[PDB]
Symmetry: C2
Subunit: 226 residues, 2 copies
């Protein structure tokens, strides 16, 4: 799962100048999110960062000494990794150059990212198999495969079947993205669900890459950009 290690080792995984994401919560409970480059660290005393490129007002309201924040750093190690930790804004300097000094916790949590990230969704569409079309809902998607559900009492598919998912790309479902083609690699029938796992073929992988690109992230998940 996730690993908790010493901050010195966790930060060694991060490249200087890389971007940090700051989720700030002010003393009165208001929230703000910004990003700023990671300078480096001083011994084990401070985490140095550049002043966020935000309006003077936002700096005034959300970037004051003493304020706490949850920071998320990135690491290129392996297929990537995310480093999460909580830090307090200790000092701000304007001379010789504007920069902030954050606190360093004893440990940080490191999350290894997957080679092929999976996205959770719920996009209606059609399943095309042997010239017949049925309804389906895309529930999980990665550049290599996906998971979809269909009406438990509609047409049934068997493992090994070459199907094509025609996902609606519009608000009212009439237009569809290029088809996600592949073979059913697994399935599960229950009283209320017909669950299927699809493994894309070359064509399917390209259209999947294209579909992920047309989608918009709402802060929680990918959805139709409309």
């Amino acid at each position: 799962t996730v690993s908790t290690i010493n901050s010195t080792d966790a930060l060694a995984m991060v490249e200087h100048s890389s971007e940090l994401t700051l989720s700030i919560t002010t003393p009165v409970g208001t929230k703000f999110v910004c990003r700023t480059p990671f300078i480096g660290t001083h011994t084990d005393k401070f985490l140095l960062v550049e002043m966020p490129k935000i309006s003077a007002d936002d700096l005034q309201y959300f970037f004051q000494e003493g304020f706490w924040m949850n920071i998320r750093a990135i690491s290129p190690r392996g297929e990537g990794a995310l480093i999460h930790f909580r830090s307090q804004l200790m000092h701000i300097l304007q001379e010789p150059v504007p920069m902030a000094f954050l606190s360093i916790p004893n440990t940080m949590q490191v999350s290894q990212l997957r080679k092929e990230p999976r996205f959770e969704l719920n996009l209606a569409g059609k399943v095309l198999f042997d010239e017949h079309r049925g309804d389906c809902e895309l529930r999980d998607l990665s550049r290599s495969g996906c998971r979809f559900i269909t009406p438990p009492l509609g047409k049934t598919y068997q493992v090994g079947d070459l199907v094509a998912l025609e996902i609606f790309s519009d608000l009212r479902g009439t237009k569809t993205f290029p088809p996600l083609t592949g073979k059913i690699c697994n399935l599960q029938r229950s009283l209320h669900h017909a669950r299927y796992g699809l493994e894309f073929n070359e064509e399917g992988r390209n259209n999947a890459k294209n579909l992920l690109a047309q989608l918009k992230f709402n802060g929680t998940k990918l959805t139709l950009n409309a």
Copy 2:
């Protein structure tokens, strides 16, 4: 050969917290050398470093704002690389924490290191071949092979000969390091020189690794530690 590239790209090759070597020349011409960790950089404005761990007096005499220095940074990229550039000490801070701000030049010179570094030397010894010993001088050495010279009028060796170099390990040449064994891979005879290139076998490589370890670096080259 050596490459000259933009400092932003050159510094991206260096890992934060890694050690920097500072060769300082004061305004009155005196010289000093110290090492200190690399913090990171602020945008393209400054190179941040930790205060060198030297005596107060040395800091007073060699680490003042305005002083120029030649810096050498290391990079793990490839078999390694050395980044050389000149920098001026722009600002020193004591609060929130002691740290120095150095200038960043437009470009830096990057030198790729070899997988198997070669050392220049001149260590007398004996060449053992077919039970006979002759004089020689070790002139070049790496973990995998070496170059040595012998009296142009002494015994001659041919390419492919399995010889053993018994390098004297003491001040007056009577004791020798474990033998550097291998095959002559090339040679060159001149009026004043008999030059040979040796390729170590397994045994030779181990003794070579051991010999490099017993040697002392005088600041210019490796020599007998005595």
